[PDB]
Ligand binder design. Structure first.
Ligand code: NA
Ligand code: NA
Ligand code: NA
Length: 444
């Protein structure tokens, strides 16, 4: 009768540094991203999040806009540098923003999903070594415990980390993201300290025994296809799958790093951070897994160097990120989790969406028909997973609004709502009107 049950959550998602602005107001100190965006050549045209969408000031208009679309759940992140702008120094004015935001969501029948860490590490923590310093587990634990104690009556759905693959490999190996190191050993140790920090928050959360409250983690996952049936392309796909997916899924859900990748990485860097006590903390039972899905990878063996797979273009339609539009991988990844990792545990899609070349036409509208078709194809796969016995509880579109897309600055637009940055005007895109209809009819 309904493709999506009344209890299924239709959501949208943002992140603190990507939308809030007010970067130096009410006691906020710099994050690693405020620092990184001011380093020459790190971010497109030296864009930064000083102002972004001005969501800090415009949050009531943004909540009313979500209520008018019929949004059922809102995923956002909490900015560590607003809450602890200096080590051990709590900022009540910081916490007050997240109380007024969550109060506005609950009064407009929107369920809050709060990401504790979405990449805006305080500069003070980075200056003490940041994710390379195992003491960060205690600093993160103190931060998480404060959020649980102050906001536990406001928020019942908690996500420890967003995309630890990005905070580790993209930030410390590839160097695209803050703080922008280029060292495999650092990226591997950071991946471990991120997961241990997740573990510490889970341990704290369970000790609080919070009424009807749930905790999880968000991972960016893909599907890797070999370019051919050759043994060479099979190993290339195995390594690329180990690098993106299994390096995080295995410690979290099996309590062991993937042994093929430990051996592979061990040829190039130290993997001596692995121990039983830490893996027990990392693998504590979660209430749900958040999946961030955008695209697949088709790979062929490269020159036998470190993670040097050649990226094959299979000749299909792509977004403005150059990401293939391949909706079948959404179903394939959710089934893989049901069969191999999460079994009957609740899953959410915590991000899915696309960047297109959006323009405001002379009629004042944004006719983003490619984003309408993108979302339609991916929701149809979510429906297929549900109809095949999948435990999918909700789907959060990335993003509510166009925002600061990290190293790309404002040059990539992911919103269902267009933002004219000169005026901070919000314009509903045709994708927003399509989504409003999907929530209302629950039919696709
Ligand atoms: Na910002
Ligand atoms: Na800048
Ligand atoms: Na678990």
């Amino acid at each position: 009768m309904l493709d999506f049950s009344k209890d299924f959550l239709f959501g949208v998602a943002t992140a603190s540094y990507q939308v809030e602005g007010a970067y130096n107001e009410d006691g906020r100190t710099m994050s690693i991203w405020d620092t990184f965006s001011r380093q020459d050549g790190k971010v497109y045209k030296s864009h930064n999040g000083d102002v972004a969408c001005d969501h800090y000031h415009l949050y009531k208009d943004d909540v009313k806009m979500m209520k008018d679309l019929g949004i059922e759940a809102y995923r956002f992140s909490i900015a560590w540098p607003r809450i602890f702008p200096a080590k051990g120094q709590y900022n009540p004015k910081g916490m007050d923003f997240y109380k007024r935001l969550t109060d506005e969501l609950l009064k407009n029948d929107i369920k809050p999903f709060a990401t504790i860490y979405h990449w805006d590490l305080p500069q003070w923590a980075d200056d003490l070594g940041g994710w390379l310093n195992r003491e960060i587990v205690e600093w993160y634990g103190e931060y998480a415990e404060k959020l649980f104690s102050e906001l536990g009556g406001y928020i019942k759905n908690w996500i420890t980390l967003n995309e630890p693959w990005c905070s580790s490999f993209l930030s410390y190996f590839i160097g695209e993201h803050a703080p922008g190191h280029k060292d495999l050993g650092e990226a591997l140790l950071v991946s471990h300290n991120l997961l241990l920090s997740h573990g510490k928050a889970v341990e704290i959360f369970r000790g609080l025994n919070l009424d009807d409250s749930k905790i999880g983690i968000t991972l960016n996952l893909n599907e890797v296809f070999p370019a051919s049936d050759s043994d060479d392309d099979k190993v290339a796909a195995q390594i690329a799958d180990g690098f993106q997916n299994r390096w995080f899924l295995d410690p979290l859900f099996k309590g062991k790093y993937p042994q093929d990748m430990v051996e592979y990485f061990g040829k190039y860097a130290k993997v001596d951070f692995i121990n039983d006590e830490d893996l027990k903390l990392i693998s504590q039972k979660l209430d749900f897994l958040g999946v961030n899905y955008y695209t697949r990878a088709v790979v062929q063996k490269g020159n036998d160097g470190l993670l040097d797979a050649v990226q094959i273009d299979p000749g299909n339609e792509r977004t403005e990120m150059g990401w293939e539009i391949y909706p079948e991988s959404l179903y394939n990844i959710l089934m893989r989790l049901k069969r191999e990792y999460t079994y009957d545990m609740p899953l959410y899609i915590t991000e899915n969406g696309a960047a297109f070349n959006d323009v405001v036409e002379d009629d004042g509208r944004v006719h983003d028909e490619k984003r309408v078709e993108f979302l339609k194809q991916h929701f149809k796969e979510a429906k297929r997973f549900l109809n095949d016995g999948g435990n999918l509880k909700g789907y959060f579109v990335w993003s509510l609004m166009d925002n600061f897309e990290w190293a790309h600055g404002y040059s990539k637009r992911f919103g269902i709502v267009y933002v004219d940055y000169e005026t901070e005007k919000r314009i509903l895109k045709d994708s927003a009107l399509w989504y409003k209809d999907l929530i209302s009819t629950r039919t696709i």
